[PDB]
Design a protein around this motif. Sequence first.
Motif, short mmCIF file in Angstrom:
data_model
loop_
_atom_site.label_atom_id
_atom_site.label_comp_id
_atom_site.label_asym_id
_atom_site.label_seq_id
_atom_site.Cartn_x
_atom_site.Cartn_y
_atom_site.Cartn_z
N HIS A 97 60.23 -3.12 35.31
CA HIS A 97 59.32 -3.67 34.32
C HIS A 97 57.87 -3.70 34.80
CE1 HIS A 97 63.28 -5.92 33.57
NE2 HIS A 97 63.22 -4.96 32.66
N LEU A 122 56.17 -6.75 15.37
CA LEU A 122 56.86 -6.96 16.63
C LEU A 122 56.37 -5.98 17.69
CD1 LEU A 122 60.60 -7.79 15.83
CD2 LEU A 122 58.68 -9.30 16.37
N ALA A 123 56.13 -4.73 17.30
CA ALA A 123 55.72 -3.70 18.26
C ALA A 123 54.33 -3.96 18.80
CB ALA A 123 55.79 -2.33 17.61
N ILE A 146 68.70 -2.14 22.59
CA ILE A 146 67.92 -2.32 21.37
C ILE A 146 68.38 -1.33 20.31
CG2 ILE A 146 65.60 -2.50 20.44
CD1 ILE A 146 64.66 -2.79 23.39
N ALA A 175 72.20 -3.66 12.80
CA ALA A 175 71.40 -4.28 11.75
C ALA A 175 71.07 -3.29 10.64
CB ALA A 175 70.12 -4.86 12.35
N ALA A 209 56.11 2.85 29.44
CA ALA A 209 57.33 2.06 29.47
C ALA A 209 58.48 2.72 28.73
CB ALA A 209 57.07 0.67 28.87
N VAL A 232 52.18 -9.54 30.61
CA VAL A 232 53.28 -10.22 31.27
C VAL A 232 54.43 -9.24 31.44
CG1 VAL A 232 54.83 -12.20 31.23
CG2 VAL A 232 52.54 -12.38 30.23
N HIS A 233 55.02 -9.21 32.63
CA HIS A 233 56.13 -8.33 32.94
C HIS A 233 57.36 -9.15 33.28
CE1 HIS A 233 53.98 -4.57 32.76
NE2 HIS A 233 53.06 -5.00 33.60
N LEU A 234 58.52 -8.68 32.83
CA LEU A 234 59.77 -9.30 33.24
C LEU A 234 59.99 -9.06 34.74
CD1 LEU A 234 62.58 -8.87 30.57
CD2 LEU A 234 61.06 -10.79 31.05
N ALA A 260 53.39 -7.14 26.83
CA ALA A 260 53.93 -6.43 27.98
C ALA A 260 52.84 -5.77 28.81
CB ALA A 260 54.94 -5.39 27.53
N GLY A 275 54.53 -6.93 21.14
CA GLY A 275 55.19 -6.56 22.37
C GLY A 275 54.35 -5.67 23.26
N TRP A 318 71.87 -2.59 18.84
CA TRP A 318 71.80 -3.74 17.94
C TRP A 318 70.97 -3.42 16.70
CZ3 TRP A 318 75.15 -7.52 18.48
CH2 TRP A 318 75.75 -7.69 19.74
N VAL A 332 55.52 -1.21 34.69
CA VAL A 332 54.82 -0.06 34.15
C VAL A 332 54.05 -0.49 32.91
CG1 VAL A 332 56.39 1.67 35.08
CG2 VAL A 332 56.85 0.64 32.85
C1 CLA Z 1 59.41 -3.29 18.37
C2 CLA Z 1 59.89 -4.18 19.24
C3 CLA Z 1 59.90 -4.02 20.67
C4 CLA Z 1 60.35 -2.97 21.44
C5 CLA Z 1 60.95 -1.70 21.05
C6 CLA Z 1 60.12 -3.36 22.87
C7 CLA Z 1 60.44 -2.54 23.96
C8 CLA Z 1 60.23 -2.85 25.29
N1 CLA Z 1 59.69 -4.00 25.81
MG1 CLA Z 1 58.99 -5.55 24.60
N2 CLA Z 1 58.30 -7.18 23.48
C9 CLA Z 1 58.34 -7.25 22.12
C10 CLA Z 1 58.84 -6.25 21.23
C11 CLA Z 1 59.38 -5.06 21.60
N3 CLA Z 1 59.54 -4.59 22.92
C12 CLA Z 1 57.78 -8.53 21.67
C13 CLA Z 1 57.64 -8.95 20.28
C14 CLA Z 1 57.41 -9.23 22.83
C15 CLA Z 1 56.80 -10.56 22.90
C16 CLA Z 1 57.79 -11.63 23.29
C17 CLA Z 1 57.75 -8.37 23.96
C18 CLA Z 1 57.55 -8.71 25.31
C19 CLA Z 1 57.87 -7.90 26.39
C20 CLA Z 1 57.71 -8.19 27.83
C21 CLA Z 1 57.14 -9.42 28.37
C22 CLA Z 1 58.21 -7.09 28.50
C23 CLA Z 1 58.66 -6.14 27.46
C24 CLA Z 1 59.22 -4.95 28.01
C25 CLA Z 1 59.70 -3.94 27.22
C26 CLA Z 1 60.33 -2.63 27.69
C27 CLA Z 1 61.65 -2.83 28.45
C28 CLA Z 1 62.38 -4.16 28.29
C29 CLA Z 1 62.57 -4.55 26.85
O1 CLA Z 1 63.22 -3.97 25.98
O2 CLA Z 1 61.88 -5.68 26.49
C30 CLA Z 1 62.40 -6.98 26.80
C31 CLA Z 1 61.88 -7.86 25.73
C32 CLA Z 1 61.69 -9.19 25.86
C33 CLA Z 1 62.00 -9.91 27.11
C34 CLA Z 1 61.17 -10.01 24.73
C35 CLA Z 1 61.59 -9.48 23.37
C36 CLA Z 1 61.52 -10.57 22.33
C37 CLA Z 1 61.94 -10.09 20.94
C38 CLA Z 1 61.29 -8.77 20.62
C39 CLA Z 1 61.60 -11.12 19.88
C40 CLA Z 1 62.81 -11.53 19.08
C41 CLA Z 1 63.19 -10.48 18.06
C42 CLA Z 1 64.68 -10.52 17.72
C43 CLA Z 1 65.52 -10.53 18.98
C44 CLA Z 1 65.07 -9.35 16.82
C45 CLA Z 1 66.57 -9.20 16.70
C46 CLA Z 1 66.95 -7.75 16.51
C47 CLA Z 1 68.14 -7.58 15.58
C48 CLA Z 1 68.50 -6.11 15.43
C49 CLA Z 1 69.33 -8.35 16.10
C50 CLA Z 1 60.62 -1.86 26.38
C51 CLA Z 1 59.82 -0.58 26.29
C52 CLA Z 1 59.16 -5.11 29.51
C53 CLA Z 1 58.47 -3.95 30.17
O3 CLA Z 1 58.97 -3.05 30.85
O4 CLA Z 1 57.12 -3.93 29.96
C54 CLA Z 1 56.44 -2.69 30.16
C55 CLA Z 1 58.46 -6.47 29.79
O5 CLA Z 1 58.21 -6.89 30.92
N4 CLA Z 1 58.43 -6.61 26.23
#
Ligand code: CLA
Lengths: 169, 41, 739, 80, 168, 160
Positions: free
Chosen positions: E70, E52-53, E90, E97, E77, E63-65, E60, E56, E93, E72
């Motif tokens: 978002h 996942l990390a 995060i 878990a 980040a 693509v930025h939210l 990220a 992500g 939750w 950076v």
């Molecule tokens: C280890 C996992 C992990 C962690 C700690 C982060 C952490 C972060 N992400 Mg990120 N991300 C991840 C995985 C992760 N991401 C994955 C797998 C994707 C691909 C879909 C993304 C796509 C993504 C984008 C497009 C952006 C971030 C951004 C960010 C930053 C702020 C907003 C945010 O939390 O994300 C928001 C996250 C999302 C909108 C998508 C997350 C989808 C999740 C991970 C997949 C489903 C997993 C499921 C929910 C697990 C359940 C958990 C359980 C305990 C219940 C933050 C540092 C933002 C940022 O500031 O970028 C610098 C930003 O624009 N992330």
Amino acid sequence: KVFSKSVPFLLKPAGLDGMVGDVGFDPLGFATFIDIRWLREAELKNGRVAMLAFLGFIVQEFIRLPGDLYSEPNGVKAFFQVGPQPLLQIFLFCGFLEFNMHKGKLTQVDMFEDGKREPGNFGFDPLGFGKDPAKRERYALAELKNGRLAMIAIGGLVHHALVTGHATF
Amino acid sequence: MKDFLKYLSTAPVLLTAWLTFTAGFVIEINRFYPDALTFPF
Amino acid sequence: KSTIVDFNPVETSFEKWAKPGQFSRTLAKGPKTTTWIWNLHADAHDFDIQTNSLQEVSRKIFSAHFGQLAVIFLWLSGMHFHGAYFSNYSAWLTNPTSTKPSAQIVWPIVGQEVLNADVGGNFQGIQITSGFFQLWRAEGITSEVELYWTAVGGLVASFLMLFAGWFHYHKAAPKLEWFQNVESMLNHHLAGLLGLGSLSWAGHQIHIALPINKLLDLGVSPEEIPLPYEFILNRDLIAQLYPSFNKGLTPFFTLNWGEYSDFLTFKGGLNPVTGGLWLTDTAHHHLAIAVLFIVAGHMYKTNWFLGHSIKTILEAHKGPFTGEGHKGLYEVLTTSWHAQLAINLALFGSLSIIVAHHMYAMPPYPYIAIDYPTQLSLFTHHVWIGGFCIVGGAAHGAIFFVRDYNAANNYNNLIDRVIRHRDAIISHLNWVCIFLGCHSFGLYVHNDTMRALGRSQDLFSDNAIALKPIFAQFIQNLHTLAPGSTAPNALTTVSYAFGGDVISVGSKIAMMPISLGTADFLVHHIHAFTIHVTVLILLKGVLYSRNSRLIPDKANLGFRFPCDGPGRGGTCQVSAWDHVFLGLFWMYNSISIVIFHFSWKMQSDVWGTVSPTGAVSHITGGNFAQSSITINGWLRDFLWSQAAQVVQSYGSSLSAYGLIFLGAHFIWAFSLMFLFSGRGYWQELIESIVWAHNKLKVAPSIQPRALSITQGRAVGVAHYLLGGIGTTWAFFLARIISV
Amino acid sequence: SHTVKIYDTCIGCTQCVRACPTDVLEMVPWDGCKAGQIASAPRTEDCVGCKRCETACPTDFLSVRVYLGGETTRSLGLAY
Amino acid sequence: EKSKAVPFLPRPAALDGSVVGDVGFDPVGFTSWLPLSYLQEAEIKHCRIAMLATLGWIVADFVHLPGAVHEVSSLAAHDVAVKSGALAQILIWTSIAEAISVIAISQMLEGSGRQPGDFKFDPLNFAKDEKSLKKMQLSELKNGRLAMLAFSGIVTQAALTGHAFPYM
Amino acid sequence: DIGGLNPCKDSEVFQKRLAKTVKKLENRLKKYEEGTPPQIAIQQQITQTKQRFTRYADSNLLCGNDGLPHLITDGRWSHGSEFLLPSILFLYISGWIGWVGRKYIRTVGQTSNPTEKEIIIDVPLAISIMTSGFLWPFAAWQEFLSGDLIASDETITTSP
Ligand code: CLA
Ligand code: CLA
Ligand code: CLA
Ligand code: CLA
Ligand SMILES: CC(/C=C/C=C(C)/C=C/[C@@]12O[C@]1(C)C[C@@H](O)CC2(C)C)=C\C=C\C=C(C)\C=C\C=C(C)\C=C\[C@@]12O[C@]1(C)C[C@@H](O)CC2(C)C
Ligand SMILES: CC(/C=C/C=C(C)/C=C/[C@@]12O[C@]1(C)C[C@@H](O)CC2(C)C)=C\C=C\C=C(C)\C=C\C=C(C)\C=C\[C@@]12O[C@]1(C)C[C@@H](O)CC2(C)C
Ligand SMILES: CC1=C(C/C=C(\C)CCC[C@H](C)CCC[C@H](C)CCCC(C)C)C(=O)c2ccccc2C1=O
Ligand code: SF4
């Protein structure tokens, strides 16, 4: 091993068998070191209070009472504007209700000491809904689910009012 | 985790946890409402 | 199936964690009275009564040592973390002479934020008197990132020691033969631990501390000083400060060790810039110590036909006056942990006191001599630790005599012959104690009564009947003449305390000749008298621990027992423990007098400021010479006078010192309830309290009992020591931080 | 010399006699208990008053009682 | 004897054949003093977290939210998301878990029968019989190890050189 | 007013104390630089000092000749928030503590190993009893009436 139906990777919790909301949800095993009857009584009371309080939010922001005191659409700010006098009367009335509905035995060790007390069963049914036992179980499950949803929603509304300050709308 | 929880139920651990919690909520009351010489009401 | 360790001896389980007192045969049945609770903690580390096997006791001791070292590593990691995050170390580096070291900030609650003092360098916090800033500067640490990394390493090391203790108790526990390899243990502790630690520290000093500190003293700011690793990868950053690294290690392997005189010096004295010892001298010292200890580690025979057997050495040292001599001492020290603890604790406390002396005498850290709070705190703390450790060594000698002493195995050896004439030893020590006390203290009282009677010419003063410490002055003269006469390769005396010039850093005196007059004679004899009385109590406890004319079977009563009864006129405190209790009291007295002498003498005749023309003005003004010779002088010109800062600390950043002053007074007075009273009164009062509880149906099932006689004494002495030491602690710290 | 008295609550468990450091107490025949024995104090001139005798007494409030009295070089435990 | 991975080292004596992804790789004998199920659960948790990390981080940086917070790089980040409270959700939750995980791993260690890492989460099937489950477990383990190493390299390179998605 | 005291809102020495404390804090504030955390902390100290003095002034508090709030604990409800209300609060809390302790002692006193359950607390039963102490005034005046609160003659007495 049986494994729970709600949490499928966990063993089935004990002490929930003959209940009206059993989905096997007790990962922390709160029913093992706390009486299940007391837990159901507390869940039902918390749920009912949360439902009444959610309805109170929605009505308060909409209707309100005449008067300068009762003029805050925000429930959190209405708690302060109304003053202590109206709130303390509600507190004392709720205490009177608690005393008379449980008939003295109000504590965890005193309630259910003699048994013969279905958890959450105050006998309150003036409108007569519940005479048919077939729909009684469904009504109990619906009340439990609505109470849980209302606990979550009561927290949500209270915290929305705290982080924004205006209202729920 | 059957004897560990029994160990946590011993007098010293329980007293330490209870006193830590007690000092905690006292200190936090005194942080959020400091310098309370009389009853707030 | 190794020949040194046993694999998986004890299972790692939490079952015994839920059964308090499982180690003891008596406590395992469960509590019936509140005495069980106190007995649980009093027997926790008494591994001798928990198992009947020396192997199990040794394994428990080994794992306990690992746990203790893990605790020490955690403490060091915390210190480094506080230096990294909650300190003004970076600001103190750029202004060591005008910024007070602080490494603990106080949260703003209940008005306690007043404790955050104006330590300087745009910082608020508690002034630190542990000297960590000076030590870190001497280590070459010029950034808080290095402190953070040292803290992380300390945390990792603490976890490693915890894992080692668990491993060596539960997974691979060494056997008794492994523990009894005292020859191998001595060889390793002397060569590896001591010598290789000195060698590694000499390497670090030479390659990191020597260049970084030289650049710091030259005025180079810490930001433009190269990172420490660059002094190793680049032989040109260190060859500019010390132009002898250009020859590499060739002079070392070609025996041309004279080339390394650039950074391996023998200068003596102090660095005029920082006021501490020359770090080149320190590196040379550690190198010589490393070589000496490595050589000393090749002495005892371990696994080859080479070295000494300690048994053969001891057994050959007989004499006409000593019978069998040291025969059997090897068996004593290889089968009794208590004897080893006695020797190690006594020598360890003596070493701590020696360290305390040599610290202020020859300040080894940059800008630590001019930080008077740090010097005073370090001396007092180390002397206190030394006294406590010495009393502990005496206690464990008594414990060995009671428990692990075998009369058959020690026939006509030194231990036997000492017990056979214990009367003579104790009687002559009694006479010496009376002589020394009579003289020292009665000379003090004679001075006091002559001053009170208006006869100033009848005192034991310098302007009166004078008792010049001629022997000590002769030694002082010999040391100040040593460079060029007896130490011809020295450039300066070892310490300016013996004589020489006044060394000042930033108009503050670092070191100065400590003159010895009639005032120092009296206080030194007071020290001798107090030490002799403490030795008397402890030696009487050790020698009479097994039997006496009163109780011919005192060994059958154990090391720790309250009495034998009201008979024989009264047999209180005849134990050997009750002698470690009285000896603790007398050690407190002796160490308190020692630290009072140090504080007053330093403040009055060493510390102070130096005028630009060379005029020396001290903190108090030289009142030690004429007013430390009477008890009224000590009461007024020292206690009353220097307690002004403690009592006037309210409302200031030193108010915590006044609060601790009052609380330590309270605790010291609280101790006297346990020290003066007895168990019967408290038991009979608990009887009426229990009656009230039973009347209200709230009497506990665990029957409340008054503390046992021995525990009452232990509580009394612990509270007495805590109160007195805390009172002196607050007094010293407030006084020496204010001025 | 101190005074030592024995009371009929004696159960004849002999723990007092085997705890006396100066051979003051001894076991004598009796018919008031199961063991058929009772402690006696025929040599109180050697009694030192250490009260080890009543520290080993299991009966409720003791069956051997030591009353301290006049002192003697034997009762004071004086080797000189 | 003669473990498959390191042919000159003995078999770790705790990994015979009955574990998915078991090539007998334990030179320092971590399995000799720790439960096998515990280590398997830790490895699978690391695999999933790092997969996942890595996804992500890479996404990220492309693509930025919507929003200024978002905007950076993934390297910077962490300090922005922690200040905005994004990582707090995060953390909450994940802590929930992980408490349920505490219960699950305790039950697995004290009997039960739950396989390490088996949370029974399977909305789709993707694994119908034992053979498919074993193959997909091996795929998950290999992909997770690869993603752990990949995230390690990505973070180290990005910290060394503050570059965009190509962290060379 | 009561006892010759005067309200702190009209006590000149009270305002002098406030002014002196604020002046000392500001003088301390002068020796630091810009918006650095030390200046923020000292400013917070000044703000808290002003708030505390203002609250004490507007609190029906009587000040003596030293400008310090004096407590009127004779029993009058006018100054009831100084002693009487905190007295009631403490009595409630301490009665809660004593009641739950006594209930736990009496509850585990009827089990096989009463002493074991005192060093190793039955946390389920302890939690059950502790949250039941909110009715301690009512429980006490329901057990005293039934004679279950006081022992009569099974209590032990000394010889005389
Ligand atoms: C280890 C996992 C992990 C962690 C700690 C982060 C952490 C972060 N992400 Mg990120 N991300 C991840 C995985 C992760 N991401 C994955 C797998 C994707 C691909 C879909 C993304 C796509 C993504 C984008 C497009 C952006 C971030 C951004 C960010 C930053 C702020 C907003 C945010 O939390 O994300 C928001 C996250 C999302 C909108 C998508 C997350 C989808 C999740 C991970 C997949 C489903 C997993 C499921 C929910 C697990 C359940 C958990 C359980 C305990 C219940 C933050 C540092 C933002 C940022 O500031 O970028 C610098 C930003 O624009 N992330
Ligand atoms: C050169 C080899 C060497 C070294 C460096 C040491 C060092 C030490 N031994 Mg040791 N020992 C050795 C050989 C060695 N021993 C041998 C051969 C024997 C068998 C006779 C023993 C038997 C022995 C016993 C029975 C005890 C010690 C203890 C100690 C510690 C004393 C406490 C101290 O001064 O704190 C200084 C602390 C430090 C400088 C911290 C760093 C030290 C780390 C841990 C390095 C330790 C070296 C270690 C032997 C390497 C083995 C690694 C392992 C993977 C094989 C110290 C860490 C005592 C102790 O504290 O127990 C834990 C103790 O009770 N040793
Ligand atoms: C290397 C140091 C060392 C070691 C390994 C031991 C080890 C031992 N000692 Mg020992 N001792 C030492 C130093 C040491 N001692 C010193 C320095 C003294 C002189 C004071 C003594 C005096 C002493 C006596 C008099 C006795 C022992 C006994 C024992 C044995 C049992 C200990 C026990 O169960 O205590 C468990 C631990 C405790 C009960 C902790 C008590 C808490 C202390 C007293 C208070 C500490 C306060 C602390 C400073 C914080 C105060 C701050 C305040 C603000 C709160 C054990 C073999 C006893 C024995 O029977 O030996 C066979 C015994 O009778 N020792
Ligand atoms: C101020 C109180 C005080 C004083 C004066 C002493 C004095 C002494 N203690 Mg100590 N002691 C004290 C408190 C004190 N103690 C406390 C609080 C404890 C509790 C722990 C102890 C526990 C203790 C132990 C356990 C031991 C001593 C011992 C000694 C003696 C050491 C030998 C000596 O110097 O004799 C010389 C006498 C003095 C210095 C007292 C003053 C005498 C004056 C200055 C000279 C003579 C005056 C002259 C004769 C007056 C005549 C006129 C008159 C008739 C009107 C000495 C009598 C040791 C002992 O028995 O002696 C070897 C010993 O083993 N003490
Ligand atoms: C919705 C929810 C749970 C919903 C579950 C529902 C509805 C379903 C329930 C049921 O099906 C079950 C389970 C079982 C059935 O038998 C009963 C029903 C009822 C049918 C939890 C929300 C939980 C919501 C949570 C935890 C929200 C936390 C928010 C936080 C911490 C915000 C913090 C900040 O706002 C601050 C404080 C300051 C800002 O500047 C910064 C940030 C960080 C943004
Ligand atoms: C956090 C919370 C609920 C969290 C629920 C979670 C995480 C649920 C998660 C799950 O469901 C999912 C997601 C999926 C399920 O299958 C599994 C689980 C795991 C079960 C509720 C908070 C609930 C919070 C509540 C109810 C708070 C109510 C606060 C009130 C009434 C405050 C009143 C005051 O604040 C005022 C108004 C003025 C003040 O000055 C005075 C007072 C009186 C203090
Ligand atoms: C008071 C007293 C008792 C009674 C003391 C008892 C029963 C101790 C009670 C201790 C309580 C129950 C626990 C400790 C409570 C403290 C508040 C905790 C210590 C404070 C911490 C900060 C360490 C004795 O038994 C005794 C025996 C022999 C000589 C003198 C005395 C003596 O003076
Ligand atoms: S109780 Fe006190 S006095 Fe009576 S004997 Fe034991 S110690 Fe001596």
